Write a protein that binds this ligand. Structure first.
Ligand SMILES: CCCCCCCCCCCCCCCCCC(=O)OC[C@H](COP(=O)([O-])OCC[N+](C)(C)C)OC(=O)CCCCCCCCCCCCCCCCC
Ligand SMILES: CCCCCCCCCCCCCCCCCC(=O)OC[C@H](COP(=O)(O)OCCN)OC(=O)CCCCCCCCCCCCCCCCC
Ligand SMILES: CCCCCCCCCCCCCCCCCC(=O)OC[C@H](COP(=O)(O)OCCN)OC(=O)CCCCCCCCCCCCCCCCC
Ligand SMILES: CCCCCCCCCCCCCCCCCC(=O)OC[C@H](COP(=O)(O)OCCN)OC(=O)CCCCCCCCCCCCCCCCC
Ligand SMILES: CCCCCCCCCCCCCCCCCC(=O)OC[C@H](COP(=O)(O)OCCN)OC(=O)CCCCCCCCCCCCCCCCC
Ligand SMILES: CCCCCCCCCCCCCCCCCC(=O)OC[C@H](COP(=O)(O)OCCN)OC(=O)CCCCCCCCCCCCCCCCC
Ligand SMILES: CCCCCCCCCCCCO[C@@H]1O[C@H](CO)[C@@H](O[C@H]2O[C@H](CO)[C@@H](O)[C@H](O)[C@H]2O)[C@H](O)[C@H]1O
Ligand SMILES: N=C(N)NC(=N)NCCc1ccc(I)c(Cl)c1
Ligand code: SF4
Ligand code: SF4
Ligand code: SF4
Lengths: 45, 154, 313, 386, 176, 93
């Protein structure tokens, strides 16, 4: 019989991610303040 | 009278076993498997066994690890400060009977020399499931109690 | 019929507190990839009952207080005052329609700290008194911003009557014109009620070596205050339109907002680490208070310069 | 005045009980006096009554979060005195499970570090991952924690068929789990307020105080025993050493999180480069023969009988052997007198020197900064006390 | 090879400055953390319904001990005392004598389950597969004395669990 | 009459629950800083007593005078904070 042993598949395993991935979200600071002030002004009116 | 006492023990036994707040001495290895019982796979909180407590709010003390002579007085003092009813669960070979350090000059050969123990959980360490089985075994032990039936017959 | 009215306020509060313990444990359980209580009663509905009975038949600590007179007074003051803060709340109709309702709740809440002090003296321990002085110093500090923020909002309402806050927000929630105040208000209530990330008494107690029924009564008082803060926050900032013919429509919408606000304390407790004691003191005396004073200046001037001064009546 | 920090947190924690005698003035810490020995169990004296195989399980129970790494250190020390060499597949398995163990330790180190500070949710997310890695331990050894798998000569048993694919499946998704952990802590102003500029240690003070591991690399010292003094097959894998710039708790926290990512990077190479062959040194005077040989061959049965009673004899000599354990440099000064039982076995625990530096690192900090500083050192009193 | 974990210089152009000011005043990085815990609330929990569901184990699992038999019913143990010799905890105590038929068998076989470290060395040392660690792990007791096993207890454990022990051995003996 | 009866009920139940739950002089080393936190609270609380009438003060014909005095009071509150801050009365080290 041929030796049978826990081995990786032919060609190896697929890629594995490891690098940090914190996606960039949100508006610029200008946009956030502009929205915040717009809400204030609407509420004031 | 006889009927009421039987149903009254049923109530308080249900309440005490359905709300077992533990104080764990994370002394050593076994505290890791103890943490795995609180982790999401087993989630001891779902049985009513809360995560954090405080010695003076605890119902059960889990001795999870080796108890050395240096630690023995402090463990007894915590047991003495627990309000009653209080139970002790001995988890793992070290707390059970000394285990792999049984013949050491500095190890208490079983925590049952220091405090009375209700349940002994074997293993080195017992798996998180083994500890959960021991905790649910203690609930059955409380379910068997008959404080008022005995009191009523005094 | 007024005694009956008092009871259908008190008892539903204590039941709401009992089941908030269940909801907190399950909301935190699922945010932590687990379940929380689901064995004691279907979906854990009997867990609060099991805990309540367990705590009351639990042997007392037998502590030996230094002042029996004032060991008992502390929990009575805590739970008695907590129930008192509910009687002017318009849901939509208050139990007592107080002309100066806002002052009444500000005045009653200022007495809450007496229970913290009185327990420290009754503790009979050096370390427990030190802990009581740190809790008091934090609570009174965050009362400063709450009082000023509250006043700034009332300058757009024009009254100390709590029902007027409902009228003030007929066309719009006050959160729009005053979201900067709403943010500091919300965080002040977390700090005021000593909730995470400001739960310093729970934390610093967990550090220093030395520092059941009576625990239960104290607990219920604290959690009835959490629910009341969030009810007050909804009334103050998310006013619900009131239909006199369909008054229960207001109650449903108002209750949902209170629950969502109460569930957000749970959400926040699941999400952040704990402040350091000096760090939450810097948060108020060096961040919130300078901004609250400047916005109090702004909100006094704003109605005048826009000709948007509200009426007294 | 004078305080004493509690033995442990109110929530369940696994690192041992400490008696910390504190001097304070106002909120400031004036002196820290760690009183240890509350978990001293006389391991080193017990090892003197055990054969070299019988003593191996004592090492799982030292840094009982990094079980197989402690085994590897002891195995390397014994293999060095024996003058033998474990087979290449065993070396790859040992590096593979060394990095899996590093993940186990760093999850415990980082999430309990947050849990003690009050950020408790990441603990629950990440011990579901630890639970799956316990399954890898149990599948090769039958035990979730104290495997006794790595032994002088190689490893006890070969990987069960299908284990490597499951390790690949776990490693595939793990980086996202680290990403969620960082979302809760890395940029959190509260977490940074609790960690930034806390427990600063200078590079020179770190070396003279005997620090190692992240305690050195957080201060900018470019040292990693896997790079400088490689063992097993660590010289055949590619990874980067994370280096800090400010020497404080926050920089050491980032180093541990980055080390977790590099461990996943190394595990990826071990899965792809795993070679065939035997798992323990083909030398029946050190490693026991296969059970089928023991039941058929006279020589095999004799060697099985002697290895499991007297044990193998180690030539006389003394070695200090150390590895890059997840907690720093873990070493053993192993003395052989020529018999089958060690004469002396000193264990160098990285946390021993680190806890000796707590007094230094806490000068001029608040009472709650001591919590963070013991956290950033990642202390397990199993290894500190022996 | 090394990398820097925290060696970034913030950009001091007014736009970047204003971005950091918005983060401070509007708590945006704190809002982001709330999203992550919210996303978990709507995830399926990892909890299993113990004791109706059980954690997955492998055939190698080292649980409660048992003494095994040959298919004839004769005991496999021949009192060689290799398990007693290798036991790291000195948890095994053995005595033996010639049986009434002259067979080499034990008269005492004790395992102190509160000394044992559940290491499996005894079942590796055994030349006849007599002593094994079975799959049972749910055997906690109410007294210390119930964890001091004698030969009758261990033989009963073998008769109790043999159906599963034999299958586990069949699934792993080619790795040994 | 209604308020007193409400107040009596709340505290009578609190006593009732408490009795069921229970039966059925030198210088503390606590710091100076914590004293000055309490005294700072009091003085700020006193200046907050004066701001409470503002929602009624805004209906006055003499708005120029009201607004000047409202901002004047709050600015002194700011200056009081600024003085403790710069005199290191808010530091905890
Ligand atoms: C005042 C209101 C108190 C209501 C009593 C609550 C009792 C609830 C209860 O017993 O649940 C059914 C319980 C549930 O059974 P259980 O708690 O034993 O186990 C349920 C099944 N497992 C554990 C596997 C999930 O029934 C009983 O066990 C009998 C207890 C009677 C106590 C009631 C006295 C009245
Ligand atoms: C709770 C729900 C969370 C949603 C998921 C997270 C999210 O979408 O918000 C993240 C967003 C991005 O912000 P950030 O990554 O910190 O980048 C710097 C700022 N541009 O950050 C934000 O957009 C936060 C926006 C907060 C809006 C101000 C809050 C005002 C409170 C008064 C009500
Ligand atoms: C040491 C342990 C102590 C424990 C004891 C309990 C602690 C104290 C409990 C708090 C006491 C609160 C008493 C003060 C609340 C009075 C609220 C109030 O102002 O009156 C409300 C109501 C009528 O509405 P009103 O607000 O007066 O309209 C004002 C028009 N501008 O009704 C009234 O105006 C008439 C009410 C007058 C009688 C109140 C007497 C209070 C006595 C307290 C003792
Ligand atoms: C960023 C993280 C946040 C952390 C803090 C937690 C904030 C939680 C905020 C809770 C409040 C959310 C709003 C709940 C909506 C309740 C739904 C409802 O039943 O009411 C409908 C309501 C519109 O009706 P209404 O409120 O009466 O507006 C009329 C103006 N007076 O509303 C329609 O939608
Ligand atoms: C649209 C019109 C405007 C458009 C153009 C913008 C103009 C307005 C903006 C410019 C106004 C000047 C701003 C200067 C503020 C910063 C001053 C400063 O640099 O000091 C801050 C610093 C505080 O640092 P900290 O760590 O907290 O403690 C001390 C250790 N440094 O060091 C300190 O010790 C500060 C101590 C002083 C504290 C001042 C407290 C402020 C008063 C409180 C009330 C707020 C203002 C009125 C309400
Ligand atoms: C047209 C003219 C108009 C004139 C008026 C215009 C107004 C312009 C001003 C707009 C911006 C005002 C913003 C006010 C919000 C309060 C800001 C603040 O105080 O945040 C700063 C505080 C300090 O954080 P730190 O990182 O330490 O900064 C260094 C300080 N030395 O950071 C913190 O507060 C940390 C808080 C940690 C705890 C937060 C945990 C919960 C977060 C989610 C809560 C969301 C709030 C929900 C609101 C519900 C309301 C019902
Ligand atoms: C929500 C209301 C529910 C009301 C239910 C009413 C049921 C009343 C039955 C009470 C039964 C209490 O049962 C008893 O309680 C006390 C403390 O609580 C325990 O503690 C007591 O016993 C131990 C020894 O037995 C003593 O050393 C101790 O000083 C004493 O406090 C007892 O161990 C327990 O047997
Ligand atoms: N584990 C904790 N101490 N926290 C916690 N969730 N306690 C809840 C316990 C409690 C207290 C009073 C009552 I009335 C009820 Cl019903 C339940
Ligand atoms: S019983 Fe085993 S796992 Fe538990 S503390 Fe002792 S040696 Fe460690
Ligand atoms: S499992 Fe290990 S400690 Fe237990 S009896 Fe067998 S050899 Fe001894
Ligand atoms: S169990 Fe096995 S090793 Fe132990 S004495 Fe019997 S035959 Fe020998």
């Amino acid at each position: 019989s041929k030796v049978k042993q826990d081995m990786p598949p032919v060609g190896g395993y697929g890629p594995i991610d490891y690098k940090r991935n914190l996606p960039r979200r949100g508006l610029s600071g200008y946009s956030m303040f502009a929205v915040g002030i717009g809400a204030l002004l609407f509420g004031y009116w | 009278g006889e009927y009421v006492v039987a149903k009254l023990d049923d109530l308080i036994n249900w309440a005490r076993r359905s709300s077992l707040w533990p104080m764990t001495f994370g002394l050593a290895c076994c505290a890791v498997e103890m943490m795995h019982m609180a982790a999401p796979r087993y989630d001891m909180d779902r049985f009513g066994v809360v995560f954090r407590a405080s010695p003076r709010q605890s119902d059960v003390m889990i001795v999870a690890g080796t108890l050395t002579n240096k630690m023995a007085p402090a463990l007894r003092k915590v047991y003495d400060q627990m309000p009653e009813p209080r139970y002790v669960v001995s988890m793992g070979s070290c707390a059970n009977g000394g285990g792999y350090y049984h013949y050491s000059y500095s190890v208490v050969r079983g925590c049952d020399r220091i405090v009375p123990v209700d349940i002994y959980v074997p293993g080195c360490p017992p798996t998180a499931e083994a500890l959960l089985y021991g905790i649910l075994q203690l609930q059955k032990k409380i379910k068997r109690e008959k404080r008022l039936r005995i009191w009523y017959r005094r | 019929m007024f005694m009956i009215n008092i009871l259908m306020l008190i008892i539903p509060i204590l039941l709401a507190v009992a089941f908030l313990t269940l909801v907190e444990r399950k909301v935190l359980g699922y945010m932590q990839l687990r379940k929380g209580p689901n064995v004691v009663g279907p979906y854990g509905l009997l867990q609060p009952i099991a805990d309540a009975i367990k705590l009351f038949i639990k042997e007392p600590l037998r502590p030996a207080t230094s002042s029996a007179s004032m060991f008992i007074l502390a929990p009575i003051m805590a739970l008695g005052l907590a129930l008192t803060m509910w009687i002017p709340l318009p849901m939509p109709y208050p139990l007592i329609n107080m002309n100066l309702g806002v002052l009444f709740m500000l005045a009653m809440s200022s007495l809450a700290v007496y229970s913290i002090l009185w327990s420290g003296w009754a503790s009979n321990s050096k370390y427990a008194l030190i802990g009581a002085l740190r809790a008091v110093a934090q609570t009174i500090s965050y009362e400063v911003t709450l009082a000023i923020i509250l006043l700034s909002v009332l300058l757009m309402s024009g009254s100390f009557t709590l029902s007027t806050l409902i009228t003030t927000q007929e066309q719009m929630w006050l959160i729009l014109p005053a979201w900067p105040l709403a943010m500091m208000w919300f965080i002040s209530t977390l700090a005021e009620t000593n909730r995470a990330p400001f739960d310093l008494t729970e934390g610093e107690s967990e550090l220093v070596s030395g520092f059941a029924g009576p625990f239960a009564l104290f607990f219920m008082a604290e959690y009835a205050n959490i629910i009341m803060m969030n009810i007050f926050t909804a009334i103050l900032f998310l006013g619900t339109s009131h239909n006199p013919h369909m008054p229960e429509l207001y109650t449903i919408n108002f209750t949902i907002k209170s629950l969502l606000l109460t569930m957000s304390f749970l959400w926040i407790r699941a999400s952040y680490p704990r402040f350091r004691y000096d760090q939450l003191m810097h948060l108020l005396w060096k961040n919130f208070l300078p901004l609250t004073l400047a916005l109090c200046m702004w909100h006094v001037s704003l109605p005048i310069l826009t000709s948007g001064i509200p009426p007294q009546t | 005045s004078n305080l004493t920090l509690n033995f442990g947190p109110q929530h369940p924690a696994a690192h041992g009980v400490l008696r910390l005698v504190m001097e304070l003035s106002g909120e400031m810490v004036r002196k820290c006096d760690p009183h240890i020995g509350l978990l001293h169990r006389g391991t080193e004296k017990l090892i003197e009554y055990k054969t070299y195989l019988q003593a191996l399980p004592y090492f799982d129970r030292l840094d009982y979060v990094s079980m197989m790494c402690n085994e590897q250190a002891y195995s390397l020390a014994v293999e060095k005195l024996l003058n033998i060499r474990p087979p290449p597949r065993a070396q790859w398995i040992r590096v593979l499970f060394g990095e899996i163990t590093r993940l186990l330790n760093h999850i415990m180190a980082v999430t309990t570090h947050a849990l003690d500070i009050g950020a408790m949710t990441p603990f629950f997310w990440m011990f579901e991952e630890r639970e799956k890695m316990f399954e890898f331990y149990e599948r090769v050894s039958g035990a979730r924690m104290h495997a006794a798998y790595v032994r002088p000569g190689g490893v006890h048993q070969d990987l069960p068929l299908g284990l490597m694919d499951d390790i690949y499946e776990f490693s595939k998704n793990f980086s996202l789990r680290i990403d969620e952990l960082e979302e809760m802590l890395t940029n959190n102003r509260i977490w940074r307020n609790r960690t930034v500029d806390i427990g600063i240690v200078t590079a020179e003070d770190a070396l003279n105080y005997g620090f190692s591991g992240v305690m050195l690399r957080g201060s900018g010292i470019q040292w990693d025993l896997r790079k400088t003094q490689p063992y097993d097959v660590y010289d055949q894998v590619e990874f980067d050493v994370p280096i800090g710039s400010r020497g404080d708790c926050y920089d050491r926290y980032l180093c541990r999180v980055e080390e977790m990512r590099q461990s996943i990077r190394i595990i990826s190479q071990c899965l792809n480069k795993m070679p065939p062959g035997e798992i323990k040194v083909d030398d029946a005077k050190v490693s026991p023969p296969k059970r089928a040989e023991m039941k058929t061959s006279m020589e095999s049965l004799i060697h099985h009988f002697k290895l499991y009673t007297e044990g193998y004899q180690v030539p006389p000599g003394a070695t200090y052997t150390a590895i890059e354990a997840p907690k720093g440099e873990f070493g053993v000064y192993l003395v052989s007198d020529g018999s089958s039982r060690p004469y002396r076995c000193k264990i160098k625990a990285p946390g021993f020197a680190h806890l000796a530096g707590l007094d230094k690192m806490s000068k001029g900090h608040m009472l709650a900064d001591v919590v963070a500083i013991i956290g950033t050192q990642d202390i397990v009193f199993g290894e500190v006390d022996r | 090879t090394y990398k820097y974990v925290n060696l970034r210089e913030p950009s001091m152009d007014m736009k970047s400055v204003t971005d950091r000011a918005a983060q401070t005043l509007l708590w945006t990085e704190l809002i982001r953390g709330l999203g992550m815990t919210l996303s978990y609330l709507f995830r399926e929990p990892a909890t299993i319904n113990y004791p109706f569901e059980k954690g997955p184990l492998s055939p190698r699992f080292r649980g409660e001990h048992a003494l095994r038999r040959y298919p004839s019913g004769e005991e496999r143990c021949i009192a060689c005392k290799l398990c007693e010799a290798v036991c790291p905890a000195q948890a095994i105590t053995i005595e033996a004598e010639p049986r009434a038929d002259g067979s080499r068998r034990t008269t005492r076989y004790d395992i102190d389950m509160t000394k044992c470290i559940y290491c499996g060395f005894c079942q590796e040392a055994c030349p006849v597969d007599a002593i094994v660690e079975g799959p049972n792990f749910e055997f906690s007791t109410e007294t210390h004395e119930e964890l001091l096993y004698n030969k009758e207890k261990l033989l009963n454990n073998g008769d109790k669990w043999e159906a599963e022990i034999a299958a586990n051995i069949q699934a792993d003996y080619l790795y040994r | 009459m209604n308020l007193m009866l409400a107040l009596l009920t709340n505290f009578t139940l609190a006593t009732l629950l408490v009795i069921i739950a229970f039966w059925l002089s030198a210088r503390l080393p606590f710091s100076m800083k914590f004293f000055l936190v309490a005294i700072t609270f009091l003085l700020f609380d006193l200046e907050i007593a004066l701001l409470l009438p503002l929602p009624w003060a805004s209906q006055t014909a003499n708005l120029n005078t009201m607004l000047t005095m409202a901002l004047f009071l709050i600015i002194l509150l700011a200056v009081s904070l600024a003085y403790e801050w710069t005199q290191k009365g808010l530091e905890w080290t």
